[PDB]
A paper describes a structure:
Twelve identical copies of NucT are present in the asymmetric unit of the crystal (rmsd ranged from 0,7413 to 0,8494 Å taken monomer A to the 11 others), forming 6 identical dimers (rmsd from 0,5647 to 0,6868 Å) with a 2-fold rotational symmetry axis. The active site of NucT and of its homologues is carried by the loops that link its seven-stranded β-sheet, itself surrounded on one side by 5 α-helices and on the other side by one long α-helix. NucT formed dimers in the crystal, a feature in common with all the PLD superfamily members described so far. The substrate specificity of NucT (i.e. single-stranded vs double-stranded nucleic acids) could then be determined by the restriction of the accessibility of the active site due to the two negative patches. However, a major difference between NucT and Nuc or Zucchini resides in the presence of an extra loop present exclusively in the NucT structure. Thus, the NucT loop might contribute to attract the DNA into the electrostatic groove of the dimer, resulting in the higher affinity for the ssDNA when compared to Zuc.
So far, NucT has been implicated both in the process of natural transformation and in the purine salvage pathway. In summary, these results show that NucT has an endonuclease activity with a strong preference for single-stranded DNA (or RNA) substrates, over double-stranded ones.
Residue numbers in the entry:
A (entry chain B): -1 to 156
B (entry chain A): -2 to 156
The structure:
Amino acid sequence: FKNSLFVLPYEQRDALNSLISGISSARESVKIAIYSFTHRDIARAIKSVASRGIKVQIIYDYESNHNNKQSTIGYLDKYPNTKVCLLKGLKAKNGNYYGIMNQKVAIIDDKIVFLGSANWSKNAFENNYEVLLKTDDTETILKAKSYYQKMLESCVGF
Amino acid sequence: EFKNSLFVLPYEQRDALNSLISGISSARESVKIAIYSFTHRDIARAIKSVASRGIKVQIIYDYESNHNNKQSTIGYLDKYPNTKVCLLKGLKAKNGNYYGIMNQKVAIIDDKIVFLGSANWSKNAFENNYEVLLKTDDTETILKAKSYYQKMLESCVGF
Ligand SMILES: [Cl-]
């Protein structure tokens, strides 16, 4: 097994290329959980692999994507083999507020998981300090796939 | 060979916090941190606790989030023994008159552990949010995180 760390902005070109190549070369499934997802090269890699027949699921943060014209959620909602939904975080202990869905995770087939600090935005891949980790570690992948299904429980239609 | 430990929050939020807190607390040499938002007082106390034992701690905070924020831990940790705090803004946007952010949430412990993932160091993240937190001892990842950490440290500015 291999971990491939990308430290942005230093490695921002390689990081975006790695994420786009991982989504585009999927054979079966792409499962994504993302807080913010505005980036149009990445939405086109999704659109491209869904057109090859791959099943894509995308969980977006509810508060920040349910009515947000810069989110790709509107753009991808209609798309063949592509299921998008919205997830709120848990009821808080502080106030009457709900948490956020702040993950930035992509799971490709049974083969690769991407995680780290980067939202899917031009800002993240051009202007920010960030970290993106790609891993083929099977135990990592299995746990991520298991909890992704669990999350899907609580997610709702766009 | 290495061990990835993934925590998926909120399901594993207490195990996640406890892993991170234990990783910092038991450091024997150094703690290197780059964090976007850091308001969680128990994690700050854990930093104080280990800095009190003579471990060197360095913390890069996001500049806009931390330069003037009473809920930030930067003020609480600034002049603490063995503790270096500083601020870092991102790059200028190619077609805008604004700068990026320092959005990493990373802790490097000795040469032995790196913690990375989505979670800001807040009660919000450890109590209410979906997040992921990954612990690894993979030495290639650790060396690389250390190398760029040093480069980051040369761009950060005083608090
Ligand atoms: Cl974030």
